[PDB]
Amino acid sequence: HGYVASPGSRAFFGSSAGGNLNTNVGRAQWEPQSIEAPKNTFITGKLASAGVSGFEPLDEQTATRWHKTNITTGPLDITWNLTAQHRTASWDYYITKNGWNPNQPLDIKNFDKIASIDGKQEVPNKVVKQTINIPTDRKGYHVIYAVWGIGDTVNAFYQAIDVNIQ
Ligand SMILES: [Cu+2]
Helices (H) and strands (E) in the chain, counts: 0, 9
Q: What angle do CA 99, 104, 105 make, to 5 degrees?
A: 120
Residues 6+ apart with CB under 8 A from 53: none
Question: Residue type for 94, please?
Answer: Y
**Residue 142 CB: number of other CB atoms within 10 A?**
22
**Does the annotation list 142 as a binding residue?**
no
Rounded Cα distance, 46 and 59, in Å? 6
Residue type, 128: V
Choose among 165, 162, 155: nearest CA to 40.
Answer: 155
To the question of whether residue 1 is assigned a binding role by annotation, the answer is yes
The CATH code for residues 1-166 is: 2.70.50.50
Separation of 61 CA from ligand 1 center, angstroms?
27
